[PDB]
Every structure is written in C-alpha cells, then in structure tokens.
Amino acid sequence: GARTWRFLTFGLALPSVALCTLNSWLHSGHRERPAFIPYHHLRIRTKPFSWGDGNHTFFHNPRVNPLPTGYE
Amino acid sequence: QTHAYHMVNPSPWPLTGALSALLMTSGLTMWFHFNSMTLLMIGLTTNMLTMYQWWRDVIRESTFQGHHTPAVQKGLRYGMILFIISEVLFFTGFFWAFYHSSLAPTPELGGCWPPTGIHPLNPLEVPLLNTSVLLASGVSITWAHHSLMEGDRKHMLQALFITITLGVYFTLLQASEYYEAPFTISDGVYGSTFFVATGFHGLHVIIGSTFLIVCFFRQLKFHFTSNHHFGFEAAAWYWHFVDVVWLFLYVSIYWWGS
Amino acid sequence: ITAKPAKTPTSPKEQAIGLSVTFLSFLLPAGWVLYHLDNY
Amino acid sequence: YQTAPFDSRFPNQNQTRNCWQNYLDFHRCEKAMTAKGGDVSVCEWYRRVYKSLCPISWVSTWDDRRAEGTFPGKI
Amino acid sequence: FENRVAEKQKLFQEDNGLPVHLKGGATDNILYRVTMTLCLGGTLYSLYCLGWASFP
Amino acid sequence: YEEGPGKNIPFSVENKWRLLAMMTLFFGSGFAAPFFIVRHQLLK
Amino acid sequence: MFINRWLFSTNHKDIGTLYLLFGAWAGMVGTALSLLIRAELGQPGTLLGDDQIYNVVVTAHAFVMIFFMVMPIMIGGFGNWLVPLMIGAPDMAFPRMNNMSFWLLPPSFLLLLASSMVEAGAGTGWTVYPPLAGNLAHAGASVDLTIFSLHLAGVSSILGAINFITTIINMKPPAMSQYQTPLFVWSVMITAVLLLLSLPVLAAGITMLLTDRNLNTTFFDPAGGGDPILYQHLFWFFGHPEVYILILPGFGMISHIVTYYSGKKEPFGYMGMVWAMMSIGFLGFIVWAHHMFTVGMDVDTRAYFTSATMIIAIPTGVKVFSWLATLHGGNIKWSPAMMWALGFIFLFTVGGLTGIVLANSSLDIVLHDTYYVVAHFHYVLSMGAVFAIMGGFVHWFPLFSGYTLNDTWAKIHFAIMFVGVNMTFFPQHFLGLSGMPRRYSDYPDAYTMWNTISSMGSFISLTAVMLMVFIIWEAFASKREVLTVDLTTTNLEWLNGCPPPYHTFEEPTYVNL
Amino acid sequence: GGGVPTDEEQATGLEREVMLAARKGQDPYNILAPKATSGTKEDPNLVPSITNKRIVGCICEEDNSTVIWFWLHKGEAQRCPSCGTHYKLVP
Amino acid sequence: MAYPMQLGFQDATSPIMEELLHFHDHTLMIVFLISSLVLYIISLMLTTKLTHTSTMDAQEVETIWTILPAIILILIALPSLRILYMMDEINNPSLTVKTMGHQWYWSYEYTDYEDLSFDSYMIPTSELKPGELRLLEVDNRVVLPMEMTIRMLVSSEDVLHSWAVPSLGLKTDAIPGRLNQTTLMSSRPGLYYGQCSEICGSNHSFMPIVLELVPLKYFEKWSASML
Ligand code: HEA
Ligand code: HEA
Ligand SMILES: CCCCC/C=C/C/C=C/C/C=C/C/C=C\CCCC(=O)O[C@H](COC(=O)CCCCCCCCCCCCCCCCC)COP(=O)(O)OCCN
Ligand SMILES: CCCCCC/C=C/CCCCCCCCCC(=O)O[C@H](COC(=O)CCCCCCCCCCCCCCC)COP(=O)(O)OC[C@@H](O)CO
Ligand SMILES: CCCCCC/C=C\CCCCCCCCCC(=O)O[C@H](COC(=O)CCCCCCCCCCCCCCC)COP(=O)(O)OC[C@@H](O)CO
Ligand SMILES: CCCCCCCCCCO[C@@H]1O[C@H](CO)[C@@H](O[C@H]2O[C@H](CO)[C@@H](O)[C@H](O)[C@H]2O)[C@H](O)[C@H]1O
Ligand SMILES: CCCCCCCCCCO[C@@H]1O[C@H](CO)[C@@H](O[C@H]2O[C@H](CO)[C@@H](O)[C@H](O)[C@H]2O)[C@H](O)[C@H]1O
Ligand SMILES: CCCCCCCCCCO[C@@H]1O[C@H](CO)[C@@H](O[C@H]2O[C@H](CO)[C@@H](O)[C@H](O)[C@H]2O)[C@H](O)[C@H]1O
Ligand SMILES: C[C@H](CCC(=O)O)[C@H]1CC[C@H]2[C@@H]3[C@H](O)C[C@@H]4C[C@H](O)CC[C@]4(C)[C@H]3C[C@H](O)[C@]12C
Ligand code: CUA
Ligand code: NA
Ligand SMILES: [Zn+2]
C-alpha cells in the first residue's frame, strides 16, 4: 500500500541519502594535484574542440585539468 | 467506427519533428566544421516546439476527448516497453565499449586499467551518494504510484515532488562531479567511456525528470484518475530504467573499473 | 484477376511514344555526363 | 638464436602483448643490471626476442617516451 | 487548484471541425505558424549552407 | 478525401501525357542525380 | 486538402504509398550508382580518373540500396499497406508516429547526398571503418553527414519497429491468435524485433565514431587505448541482423505469392515457416564475427562462428522446401509475380549456398574482401530482395492502384532482368576465386574478361529498369479497373476492393471462437 | 486523504462509452471474441452489424492457422465455404 | 598470380592452400548438387496437370528436411575445422619478418639479426619493363627462403590494410596498434603476388605484395649483401 511505501521512503530511503550526504561532505576536501606528465594517451587533440580556443574541454577546471602543455 | 482504436486527426508534428532532426544534424555539422551554432539552435527550438505540441495533443486526445480506451492504453503500454528495450540496447553498446577497453588494456595505457596517469573518483564518495539518491527516488515514485491508485491527491503530489527533487539532486551532484573530475573526455579511452556512458545516462535523467515534472503539473490539474494514468506509469517505468542503468554504470565504471 | 476494358486504351503507337520518352529520360542526361567526362 | 620461439603465454594471432612484454622485460633487466653496475648480457634473451617481434616504429616511439619520462609501462 | 477537466472536455469536444492541434483556439494557430515557419525557413537555410559547403 | 482508382495517389493520372512528363521528371531526376554528383566532384 | 492528406497523413495506406514512391526513386539513384561502378570496371584502366570518387560511389550505392530502397519498400511500403489489411485493423497502433518514420527518410537521404557533395565525399565503404573513416584519413564534414544520415534512418526504423510490433500484437481480432496471422505479418513482426535490438547498437557505434572525429574521444584510436576492431564488432552486431532484416519481409511476400499462384488456400507447413523465421532471427544475433575472420581473432572463436553460421541453413532449408511443397499439386498460374517468386527461390538458394562456403573461416581467409563475397550478397540480397520486391509489386499493384498491369510486358521485364543480373554477378564468382579484391577501381589485366562481361550484364538490367517505368506508366495510362480477384477467402487484403477505401475495417471483422 | 477523480466521474468520449457498455455486459466496440453456436441451419452464428454486410473470418477447427474470409450479407444465412458453418447477419 | 579466363583458385604454393583446394572441391560438389536439386524440384513441381490442393501434413517430411541438411553441414564442418586447427598448429619458424601497411605501400622489417628494412611500392604502368605485370610489380620484393616455416607479423602505421597472397592461402588484416601473426611456407621457388585487401582510401587498388622465394643459401647471400 501507499502507507508502506511512504514508511520506506521516510524510514529507510531518505535516511540512507542523509547518511551518504554526511559521508560525502566529510570527504569533500580538495586533493593535492599530481605532478604533470605529458603522457601521449591523455589530453588527446586530434581536432580542435568547437568552442573557446579549441584546446579546453567543455567542463575544464583550471585547478585539476592540465592542458597538453601542463597546468594553466 | 465499432472498434475501440484511435483514428488520429491529420497532424503537422511528424513533419516538424522530421525537419527538426534535419536541422539538429545539419546544425551539429555546421557547429563542428563551419564554426556556427545557427542551424543547431533553430533545430533544438523546433524539436522542443514539436515535442510540446505533439504530447499536448496526446493529452487533449485522452484526458479531454476520451480516445484512450483500454485497447489504446494496451498499445501504449507495449510501445513504451519496446522503446525502453531499444534504449537498453543503446546503452549495451557503451558497456561493450567499456568492457572491451578495460578487460584488454593496450600498451599505450601502460597495459593496465585504470590507465597510467588516470586518478579515478572514489566510488564511496559522490558516486555512492548518487546511488542512494536514485535508489531513494525509486522508493518515492512507488509511494506516488500507490497514492494515486488509492485516490490520495496530496500524498501523490508530495511523493512525486520528492522523486523530482532527488532527480535534480543527482543532476547537480553529477554536474559538480564533472567539473571536479581531474580527467576529461580527451583522457584516452578511460575519459571517453566515462563521459560518453555517464553523459548519455545524465541526459536520460534530465529527460526522465522532465517527464516526471509533466506528470506533476498534469496531477496538479487533476488529469489522472485513480485507474487511468498511463503517462505516470510510463514516466515511472522510464525512471526505473534510468535507476537500473545507473546501478550498472556504478558497478562497472565507478567500482569495478576503478 | 478480371478487369473492366481500359477507360483510355493505349494504342501500339501511344506505347512506342511512352517507351521512347521513358528510355530517353534515363539515357540522355547520363549520356551527356559520360560523353563530357574528358572535359571534366 | 634464429628467431623468437613459440611462447605458450601468447599462442594466438594477436602478438601485441608478446612484443610489449619482452620490451618491458629487456628494459627492467637492463635497469636492474645497470643499477648495481652488473652485466646487461644477462638481459640478451629479451633483447633478441623484442627486436625480432616488435615493429621498429613501436621500439623507436617507446625509446623516445622513456627518454621523455612519458613511457606508461612500469620499468 | 480546482478540477476544471470538465470545462476542457467541453472545449475539445466542441463540434467545430478543427483538428486537435488547433482546437485550443488562436494561440494554437500562432504556435503552429511559428513552428512551421522556423522548420521551413531553417530547411531553406540548410540547403543554402549545403550550396556554400559544396564548393571550396 | 477523394476515393477510388487514380484518386488515392499524390499525382494526377487524369491525362496520360502530363503523367508521362511527371513520371519522366520523377524517375529521371533520381537516375540523373549520381551522374551530376560525379561531375560536380570531378569539376573540383 | 493536398497538404493535409500527403504531408500530415495518419493513414496506413497513404503512408505506404509515400514509402513505395520514395523507395522507387531511391532505387533509380542506387541503380545509377551501380552503373557508374560497372562503367569504371568495364574495361582495364581508369574511367573517372579519381579513385576517391569511385570509393564514394561504391559507398553511396550500398547505403541507398539498403536504407532508402529495400527497407522503405518492404517495411514502410508493403508493411504499412498490407499488415493492417491482413489483420482486419483500422490502421497502425501509432498512426501519427508512423508519418514521422516516413518523413525522417527524405532528410536522411538529403544528408547522404550532402556527404557526397561536400569535400571529397565519404569514400569509406558502407562499413565506415575507422581509421579510414576518422578525422585524419577523412577530415571534414562528409563522414559526419553520413553518420547523421544513418542516425535519422535508424530513428525512422526503430519507431517503425515499435509501431509494427505493437500493431501486430495488440490489433488483431480478439479470436485471432498469433498462429492465425498470415506469414507476411509474421515476417514483419520478426523483422521489427531485429530492427529494435540491432539499430541501437549501430547508433552507439557510429556515435562513438562521431565523438572520435569531433570531441577527442579515442574509442577506436590506439593512441588513447582504443581499438579499431571494437567498431567492427559494434557495426557487425547490427550488420548481420540487418541482412536478415533485408530478406525476412521478402520471405513473407514469397510465401503469399507462391501460395496464391499455386491456387492453394495456405502455405505448406505454416508452423514450420513461423519456426524457421524465428530461428533465423535468433541465430542472426550470434554469428556477426564471420565478417571478421581475417582481423586476427582466436582459433576457437573462429571455430564457434563457423559452426553457428552454418546452423542458419537448417531453418532456411525448411522454408525453401516448404515453398516447393506449396507448388506441389498446385493449379499453377504462370503470372509475372509467380515468375519473380520462382526466380527468387532459385537465386536465393544459390546465394545462400555461397554464404555457407564463406562461413568456413579457413576458406574465408582466401575469399574475404574478394568478388566472391560481392557475388554471394548480390545473389542472396540484391536478387533475393529485388525479386521479392518485384513479385510483391506486380502481385499487389492492382490492390494499391485499382488498375491492372499488362501481363505480357511484365513477363518481358522479368525475362530481361533474369538475364541481366545473372550475366552481371555469376562471373564475379570466378573473379573472387581467382583473387580479385573488392573495393577496387582497376584490376590486373588477367581479370579483364569477367569484368567486361559483368559490366555488359549491368546494362541489360538497366534496360529492364527503364522498361519497368514504362510498364507502370502504361497501367496508369490505360485505366483497366479491377473487378474481381480469386482466392479472397484466404487473402483478406483484397476483400475491400481495389483500391480499398481510405478507411477500412471501421466495422471490424467477426471471428468467433 | 482523497481528491483524485475516478473514471466514473471523469472518463469521457469513447473511453466512457466502452466503460458504460461493459457495466451492462454489452460489447458494441467488438473488444471480446464472440462464442460460436453449433452453427447449424436451425442455430446459425448470429453476426451483428450496423450495416447490411460484414466480413466474417471462420476458424473452421480449433488450431487451424488458415482463416476463411467472406462477406456475410443481410438475408438468408450463408455458409463458410470451407466447413459449411452457418452465419446469419443481424443488423 | 591469376591468368586470363581463370575460373577457380590460383594453383596452391603452400600445403595449407593445397588443403583449401581439396576442401573447396568437396564443398562445391555439395553446392552444385543442392542448387541442381532445387532447380530440378521446381521444374518437377511445375510440369504436371495432376493436382492436390487440400491441406497436406508436414510432420514426416520436415524430419527429412532438417536431419539431411544437418548431416551435410557436419560433413562440411569436420574437414573445415580440421584445416582451421592445422593453420593454427604450433610451428617452429626459423625466420620472422614484419610488414607495415601505409597509404599506399608496404614496408618490410627483417630484425632477427640485422636491422634490415625497406619500402615496397607498385611500379607505375608508365615505368613497367617489357613483359612485367600492370598493377602487380613492386620495386623491392619480399625475399624469403623456400621450404621453410616463416612467421609474418602484420601491422599498419595509418589506416587498416590487409596483407594477402592468394596462392599461399594468406590474408591478415593490418591494424594500427596490433601485431597480427600468420605462418608462410612455400613448397616452390618463384614470384607470388597479392594485393591490399582492406579498403584504405584512394590508392587501395595500387599497393601490391610480391614474394620472391629462393633457396636458403641465396636468402643468406641476399641478407649478407644488405649490410
Ligand atoms: C539478404 C541478405 C543476406 C542474406 C539472407 C545472407 C545470408 C547468409 N550469408 Fe551473407 N552477406 C550479405 C547478405 C546476406 N547474407 C551481405 C550484404 C554481405 C557482405 C557485407 C559486406 O561486407 O559489405 C554478406 C556476407 C557474408 C559473410 C562474410 C564474408 C566475408 O566478408 O568474407 C558470410 C560468412 O559466413 C556470410 C554467410 C551467409 C550465410 C551462411 C547465410 C545464410 O543465412 C544462408 C542460408 C541459405 C541457404 C543455405 C540456401 C537454402 C538452403 C537449403 C536449400 C537447405 C540445404 C542447404 C545446405 C545443407 C547447405 N555472408
Ligand atoms: C539491396 C542491396 C543491393 C542492390 C539491389 C544492389 C544492386 C547492384 N549492385 Fe551492389 N552493392 C551492395 C548492395 C546492393 N547492390 C552493397 C551492400 C555493396 C558493398 C558496398 C561496399 O563495398 O562498401 C555493393 C557493391 C557492389 C559492387 C562492388 C563494388 C566494389 O567492390 O568496388 C558492384 C560491382 O559490380 C555492385 C553492382 C550492383 C549492380 C550492377 C546492381 C544492380 O544494377 C543490379 C540490378 C538491380 C536493380 C537495377 C534494382 C531494381 C529496383 C528498383 C529500381 C526498385 C523498384 C521499386 C519498386 C518496384 C517499388 N554493387
Ligand atoms: C550533468 C549530467 C549530464 C550532462 C549532459 C551534458 C551536457 C552537454 C551535452 C549534452 C548531451 C550529452 C550526451 C552525450 C554526448 C557526448 C558528450 C557528453 C558528456 C559530457 O558532458 O562530457 C563532458 C565533455 O562534453 C563535451 O565534450 C561536449 C558535449 C557537447 C556536444 C555533444 C555533441 C554530440 C552529440 C551526439 C549526438 C548523438 C545522438 C544519438 C541519436 C541516436 C538515435 C538513433 C565532460 O567534460 P570534460 O571537461 O571533458 O571533463 C570534465 C573535467 N573537469
Ligand atoms: C531541458 C530539457 C532538455 C531535454 C529535452 C529532451 C526531451 C525531454 C522530454 C521528456 C518526455 C516528456 C513526455 C510527456 C508525455 C505527455 C503525454 C502523456 O503522458 O500522454 C499520456 C499517454 O502516454 C503516452 O502517450 C506516452 C508517451 C511516452 C513518451 C516517452 C518519452 C521518453 C522520450 C525520450 C526522448 C528521446 C531520448 C533518446 C536520446 C538518446 C496520456 O494518457 P494518460 O496519462 O493515461 O492520460 C489520460 C487520462 O487523463 C484519462 O483519465
Ligand atoms: C543527432 C540527433 C539526431 C536525433 C534526431 C531525433 C529524431 C527525431 C526528432 C524527434 C521528434 C520527437 C517528437 C515527439 C514524438 C512523440 C511520439 C509518441 O509519443 O508516439 C506515441 C507512440 O509511441 C510510443 O508511445 C512509444 C515511443 C515514444 C518515442 C518518443 C520519441 C523518440 C525519439 C528519439 C528516439 C531514439 C531512441 C534511442 C535508442 C537508440 C503516440 O503515437 P501517435 O501516433 O502520435 O498517437 C497515438 C494516439 O492514439 C495517442 O493519443
Ligand atoms: C526569427 C529567426 C531568426 C534567426 C536568427 C539566427 C540566430 C543566430 C544568427 C547569428 O549567427 C551567429 O553568428 C555568430 C557570428 O557573428 C556565430 O558565432 C559563432 O562563432 C564564434 C567564433 O567567434 C564561436 O564562439 C561560436 O561558435 C559562435 O559564437 C554564431 O555561432 C552564429 O550562431
Ligand atoms: C549508364 C547509362 C548510360 C547509357 C548510355 C546512354 C546512351 C547514349 C544516349 C545518348 O546520349 C547523348 O549522346 C550524344 C552523342 O551520341 C551526346 O551528344 C554529344 O555529341 C554529339 C555528337 O558528337 C554533339 O552533337 C552534342 O553536342 C554532344 O553533346 C549527348 O550529349 C548525349 O545526351
Ligand atoms: C526563421 C527561419 C530561420 C532563417 C535562418 C536564419 C539565417 C541567418 C543568416 C546569418 O548567417 C550567419 O552569418 C554569420 C556572419 O556572416 C555567420 O557567423 C559565423 O561565421 C563567421 C564568418 O565571418 C565567423 O566569424 C564565425 O564563425 C561566425 O561569426 C554564421 O555562420 C551564419 O549563420
Ligand atoms: C496546498 C496544496 C494543495 C494542492 C491542491 O489540492 O490543489 C498542496 C498539496 C501538496 C503540495 C505540494 C507538496 O506538499 C510537496 C511540496 C512541498 C513544498 O514544501 C512546497 C512545494 C510542494 C510541491 C507542494 C505545493 C503545494 O503546497 C501543494 C500542491
Ligand atoms: Cu592498403 Cu587497401
Ligand atoms: Na577502372
Ligand atoms: Zn469455416
């Protein structure tokens, strides 16, 4: 019935989301970025991207996404 | 007629939909090759206008005109199941690409998975939260379904609102994840498989959330009866499909592939 | 199958015209391109 | 030594991993023998096998990447 | 909100010969004309783009 | 809508010679198109 | 009224007519491309002086014949016309979505003809394998326009498959079980299931190719840890089902035609025919890697794919023998449609048998990427599909139009086409065995005689095509209106007259239990 | 907690006609398979029609795959041309 | 190489091509017989005024129609798979040669002992020496010892190609990032021709393969000369 599924929603499901939210928020600190190495299997550029200067990924994050030549 | 099936009024939306497809595809071509977004933005606009008017007309035909007899509803049930099956097979192709690449990592990767230089996301942090969010939304949508069958307007709306809120939370968490990820779509086959498979999934979450929002407004306007609410059923089936694809992504790409 | 007599019978001469025009509609444009391949 | 013998580790038409493994083995052994100032002649079997099996362009690209610090295999 | 489905049933069942995509009134006509004009105009623009792209 | 032989089609069969012209343009345009595309590519 | 009827259709018959017109037009394009192929090969040396253009012509020839001629005619045309009539249904389940499956095809075709007009075309083969199809070896828009053409064709066919499966399952008379539906209806349902499952996998694969070309993904690029062979698996996982998709509606039409012109009320061994089509459909998903016997896969994998592929001969042979057993004891009417169907049975058998030769991976090493393969599929696919289409077309033209064809002209047409296709393709077996590669613009001098003969055959088939257009003109020009046809008791699609009214089965059939 | 309409309150058009006919045990829209009579001349199958003719399909024996199709006209009962089962039109 | 008006396979140069010829002869006899039976039965069904139009029972005849084809397929598959497993069987090669496909020519690497490598280009028709073969000759042939097991490794530096030599029973795709293995053994000296067998762009028709098979002593003299 509806009463049973509401009971599961508030008694199990949303508590689970609250506990996973607490777990995530406790581990949300910025990690120390690894040394840049210009590996040839990464930062692939076979054609410029169709936006910006052609060399930045769509959700480029300067802090953690180096360009082919390194961190900005 | 002395059959129960629906003879549909002649409609312009098939043609506007087909032309929207031409404009979106020619538009993507003109964006990738001729440095221009014009055709693409016309195509996206005509596609949204076509889907709005087509599904508006289905609501007019059913809620307002009474054309959805049990035989018609049975056909729509089959149609939605078959559509979901086609979407399962589309995802299967992306899983096949993922397993092909990760089970036999090539020398360019370092002959290992994850590749040399890839730092995967911790699957116990936001990916686990996303898992709890979509599983919870599968429980809340089931509460909504039972509330509607039991004739309870208030609890159907509360349960559906919670389901939509969880879908939006997943989408904002995934957007945040994408921005914080230290790897990109250009980081070899790891980034390719990650972003294309999770990105088509994220698109399906946005589609599913949109479908639930349509059901929320139709419910506010009293369209659904306790017995007749196929749009809600189809949106729930689609939502469960989105959940299940996530669980396979989580186990395959985030956990086993880390 | 059984049918009514032709409403608008197509005589042997009418058939020779239709056949000729049909064949020419296929052959002349392709012929023009193939003849001029050198010029291309 | 004539050519690389059958290796039961790599029994199929795709020999990519056979070339890769012997290249790694040669360079791991060479590093091990050099680091104690030991003798690289100990590494000779792997050198002959990878030289026999590996395309020149693969060897040359891998050598370049080792010198660049971008070789993705562990040596 | 109040249940106004009966009022919409009456509107969409009116014997006026209109197809369902125009039966809501003048706003349906405007939205149809905007859609079809963008589709047809867009298609003509795609053909122009084809003509441009077919040559160096 | 009009029903019956010659009336369930998007082209007229009222006049067999107008029909011959329309069928000529229809099938001829399709058959010609690849020859003219080959010509277009060669003239590049 | 004209725009409402023909652009805004929600009518299965009018949409079927649109598909037949579209397909016939596409067939002219495909045929023109085929004649350009055979003109390049018809004497040693170069004709076009541009082997990239030759490769574009070969690529376009295949896409047009498969996606714009066969599938639109068989599924969109005969399927939309006949399936609702054969089950007494008033239309398709989704009559408005049906119209969008149709209207996606002109844009799809426009994208293909854009691919060929921009840059230097997509000279890839219809397989579109990377890295030749990638952004280095095929820089620019042509391959992306080809990918988009296939996306639109794929959406059209997936939505069509949903429509046909729903219609066939949900819209029969309540007394009619699945085992009381005609074989053509079975053939369309099975075809639709194959489309629903196979096309999404193609869509995934060509989407990966799109992203490798434009978003710096490396699914198929070894520099990023990708693999060109992954593309081949995804393509062929679709592509083997696709070849059964192309023939299954043909098998359905052949069953109807052989039954009708043998004067029988029913095909021989109905449940065996259903079993055979379902068996072919199922086995069709587990055999794809027989397209990849030279790529370097493991011996045990080759052994499995040889063995699984050979199994398909068993249900296929049940159908061939069942057609023969339907002729057995018949009062045979030597109609032009019967001639097409008998040509089908023989030519399909020849092509199926050369398929069994190719299934043997060992021998396939020598035959792969040769004219032996081209000969195999022009028998089973090209002749099989086309002969089933022409048989269905001359059989059902009077239903669709209300007018009769000239039977003597139709027999002349058959005779010319039979000579032309056999003169074109039979010698390609010798070219294959003797080692001539496919996808070649020119050949070593030894191969001249059989290429010359093959190219002469191609012109005979062109004469047949031109005559077909005249024959259709002559029927519409003369206006011989149908009165009666025989065997309506076992051919429901005829029982509303010729042509049937816009709306049929407004009052459904009465069928009791 | 209420506020959701019922089919009885809100169904309209053909859906409502089907809903009301089912409550009366009537099948005007041909959703159900009719049960055969013995099909003799004294006890013919009674075939309803809104007009003067209707197509009958006869499954002569259980599990036949072949259906026999024919127009049944108003007037004297007609017989299935395969099994001779009698059918009578009842406008 | 092929010769004018040729109907069948090039004469076998290797034991595995011999096996394939015998296996094709076996399989073609079956193809002919089944093709002929179907045509004959069509003609038999169509040549009598006698009729039987009532329902026919299918059960008995479908046993024949499934069992007999199953037996035939087993009789094709058994020898087919025997040859498949022969062409995989562990051989001890005495020589490894690499070939790399390019747009549009082959390169060859003999790196067992010396770093020998060279490129192999089609001779243009305008440059053929009298009596030489249009589209088939190359500038630098693949010199190999006869009557010896050779390991060929095949890859590509650009797009897909396919390295083929019909008279030896050979066809191995050339895939960038992949090293595909095949075995070559010639029973005879001579020149053996093949052609690129995966579409690789505009000059696919024009990048042939020529093997030059010579006694070991002459192969060694050739290798020694290359220093
Ligand atoms: C209508 C389309 C169609 C159909 C139905 C088939 C049917 C079959 N095909 Fe074919 N095929 C193609 C279209 C088709 N094919 C295409 C387009 C290609 C090329 C793709 C490309 O590369 O571009 C291709 C390629 C292709 C290959 C790849 C070859 C290569 O590239 O090297 C192989 C490999 O096994 C294959 C096998 C078969 C087999 C075994 C069947 C079986 O289904 C045939 C079964 C039928 C019979 C056997 C005859 C009837 C049976 C009897 C009378 C009973 C008794 C018979 C026996 C006991 C044997 N085909
Ligand atoms: C259905 C599929 C189909 C059909 C019908 C055909 C028809 C023809 N094809 Fe082929 N072809 C392919 C599918 C098809 N083809 C494919 C998949 C390839 C491989 C491409 C690649 O390698 O990538 C190929 C490749 C191919 C090659 C090899 C090219 C090369 O390797 O370089 C050749 C060579 O001769 C050829 C010739 C022909 C000829 C001469 C015809 C015809 O001229 C034969 C006669 C048939 C007709 C003329 C059609 C008639 C039908 C109509 C006009 C429709 C009528 C409509 C109604 C009645 C409603 N085609
Ligand atoms: C938040 C959850 C979900 C977000 C949704 C995504 C937002 C943008 C686009 C939406 C469409 C998504 C579908 C999947 C397609 C491809 C890529 C999308 C995945 C994505 O968003 O990936 C991003 C890249 O996007 C890119 O390239 C740019 C992508 C934009 C252009 C894509 C164009 C390609 C369209 C392909 C069409 C295929 C249609 C198939 C139809 C089949 C029918 C048969 C990842 O960002 P990044 O900076 O590399 O790494 C993060 C580093 N901090
Ligand atoms: C910012 C947003 C960007 C993203 C844009 C992309 C698109 C998003 C769109 C989301 C989908 C919205 C669908 C709304 C459908 C409303 C119509 C509806 O739900 O119609 C119902 C029928 O269902 C039916 O047709 C069922 C109709 C099924 C529709 C299925 C939709 C899923 C579509 C996915 C789109 C393709 C994606 C693939 C990409 C790879 C009507 O019947 P009932 O509900 O029984 O009512 C009758 C009662 O009132 C009587 O008492
Ligand atoms: C690069 C980008 C290329 C992509 C181009 C996109 C292609 C085309 C543009 C799409 C425009 C969509 C417009 C809306 C379509 C709504 C269809 C729909 O909802 O169809 C319904 C049937 O399908 C059902 O239910 C179940 C089926 C519902 C399907 C909804 C639409 C899906 C479109 C994309 C799907 C791809 C699938 C992904 C798997 C590969 C209703 O059928 P109708 O016949 O209308 O009415 C019947 C009446 O009785 C109703 O009262
Ligand atoms: C009633 C119907 C009215 C239809 C009106 C159509 C709306 C758009 C018209 C203008 O077209 C735009 O022009 C810009 C140039 O002036 C382009 O810049 C493009 O080029 C830039 C390069 O500077 C890139 O950043 C982007 O791709 C992009 O902005 C842009 O893409 C393109 O769309
Ligand atoms: C693959 C399908 C093709 C099959 C072959 C078609 C058969 C040929 C049809 C005739 O085509 C015509 O041939 C003429 C020559 O006979 C050409 O005239 C050309 O040559 C004439 C004579 O030299 C000149 O007078 C003209 O100006 C000149 O255009 C003309 O252009 C062309 O239309
Ligand atoms: C209602 C029906 C719809 C009607 C269709 C509307 C057609 C609008 C025509 C405008 O055309 C635009 O012109 C821009 C300027 O000429 C181009 O800008 C782009 O092209 C420029 C060329 O200078 C580049 O600088 C940039 O990529 C960018 O600004 C752009 O591509 C193109 O779309
Ligand atoms: C008062 C009103 C009654 C609706 C009605 O019966 O017309 C209530 C019923 C359920 C309510 C919704 C549900 O309680 C769930 C949501 C609760 C949030 O705090 C506000 C928005 C929210 C989406 C509510 C909006 C509105 O207040 C609703 C729609
Ligand atoms: Cu190299 Cu084909
Ligand atoms: Na040539
Ligand atoms: Zn009966």
Author numbering:
A (entry chain T): 12 to 83
B (entry chain P): 4 to 261
C (entry chain Z): 1 to 40
D (entry chain U): 11 to 85
E (entry chain W): 1 to 56
F (entry chain Y): 3 to 46
G (entry chain N): 1 to 513
H (entry chain S): 3 to 93
Article sentences:
At site 2, CO2 or N2O was oriented to form weak hydrogen bonds with both the hydroxyl group of Ser108I and a water molecule (Wat2). In the untreated CcO, we assigned the electron density to a water molecule (Wat1), although other molecules, such as nitrogen (N2), could not be ruled out. At site 2, weak electron density was observed in fully reduced CcO and in previously reported fully oxidized CcO. Although this peak was assigned to a water molecule, it could be replaced by a gas molecule, such as O2 or N2. In Xe-untreated fully reduced CcO or previously reported fully oxidized CcO, no significant electron density was observed at this site, indicating that unlike Xe, O2 and N2 were not bound stably to this site. In Xe-untreated fully reduced or fully oxidized CcO, weak elongated electron density including the Xe3- and Xe4-binding sites was observed. This electron density could be assigned to the detergent tail or mobile gas molecules that could be replaced with Xe. In native (Xe-untreated) CcO, there was electron density assigned to H2O in this cavity.
pmcCytochrome c oxidase (CcO), a terminal enzyme of the respiratory chain, catalyzes oxygen (O2) reduction coupled with the proton pump, generating a proton-motive force across the membrane. Mammalian CcO consists of three mitochondrial DNA–coded core subunits (subunits I, II, and III) and at least 10 nuclear DNA–coded peripheral subunits. Cytochrome c oxidase (CcO) catalyzes oxygen (O2) reduction at the heme a3–CuB site in the transmembrane region of the enzyme. It has been proposed that the hydrophobic channel that connects the transmembrane surface of subunit III through subunit I to the heme a3–CuB site is the O2 transfer pathway.
